[PDB]
């Protein structure tokens, strides 16, 4: 952020920086950066095979430590993945999610800070 | 460029436009039969099923069918009226405009049935230009200036 | 596949020079035409 | 870091990115039959759950 990590910690408030998560999907994680203790550090609950969903969150959100914060109750989810296509001796269709954003090195979460 | 120290104003309007149009058209017939071989006949018919391409990081298993040119599009779905139980697996011809597809992501022609007609395949694993859209920007210079 | 051009303006919002907003807000057109047709 | 305690600010803008990318995938085939078993043959078929 260019702030000097040892008298301007004050400014860690959202007037002066701030943060967002995207999959550039219109999935967004609003981040208030006066409410994080220490640490930017972002965790997942993902699950898989069955129902495919990662959602990443940002750890310890707006605890006064140290206590899970909101936890995953405030989220970037993401879970639109694609299916692939076949046919048959009948072509059943796949569903089309983040692979063109793969083929262009921009699957995955991103970060915009300000 | 950002505070609010600024005079008031109350007086836009519309002052300039430029516009990228799109000018040409391409077509993309995406059917489930692979028409690059053979259709069997009225009464001897054969349904070839299709290999599909992929493009842009997408398996397609329908054949996707380039066309720059409408005609060529006209003969080949004129010759399918012939063949019905082709013609029925057809998903759509969808018009998009011009060139946003690259010659590499395409087969050479290819004799249809027959026949005397010819088709490109759009696949290769290719990926389709992401124009830039130079009709509707606008340089620092250009820009202060228009 | 899918028939979708996002149009967006480049490097929006940086202070540069980084992907600005990138595509997470752009013009996106995808309604194009299909073409109908008759079969026996 | 709460309070509206501060100086009127209007300049924001995007500073830096970081990115976790998904840069390599992994495929879940999901079908509804024992594939670690023996199909039949296009006459003799077996189904297997």
Do not use: C
Not at chain 2, 53 to 79: A, C, Q, R
Not at chain 2, 97 to 103: A, D, E, H, R, V
């Amino acid at each position: 952020l260019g702030l000097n990590p040892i008298n301007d910690k004050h400014l860690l408030r959202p007037n002066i920086v701030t943060a967002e998560l995207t999959d550039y999907a219109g999935n967004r994680l609003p981040i208030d950066l006066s409410l994080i203790e220490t640490n930017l550090e972002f965790d997942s609950f993902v699950t898989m095979g069955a129902k495919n969903e990662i959602k990443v969150y940002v750890k310890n959100y707006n605890a006064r430590g140290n206590n899970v914060g909101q936890y995953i109750d405030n989220a970037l989810t993401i879970n639109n993945f694609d299916t692939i296509g076949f046919s048959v001796d009948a072509i059943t269709e796949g569903h089309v999610g983040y692979a063109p954003l793969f083929k262009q090195d921009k699957f995955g979460v991103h970060l915009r800070l300000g | 460029r950002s505070n609010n120290d600024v005079l008031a104003t109350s007086t836009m309007r519309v002052h300039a436009i430029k516009s990228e149009l799109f000018t040409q058209l391409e077509y993309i017939l995406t059917i489930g039969a692979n028409l690059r071989k053979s259709f069997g006949t009225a009464e001897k018919p054969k349904f070839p099923s299709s290999s599909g391409s992929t493009h842009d990081g997408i398996y397609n298993p329908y054949d996707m069918y380039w066309f720059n040119d409408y005609e060529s599009l006209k003969e080949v779905m004129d010759y399918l009226t012939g063949y019905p139980w082709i013609q029925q697996s057809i998903k759509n011809v969808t018009i998009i405009p011009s060139g946003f597809i690259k010659q590499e992501s395409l087969n050479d022609h290819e004799p249809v049935n027959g026949g005397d007609l010819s088709v490109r395949k759009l696949g290769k694993q290719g990926v389709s230009n992401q124009k830039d859209f130079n009709a509707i920007s606008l340089d620092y210079q250009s820009l202060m200036f228009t």
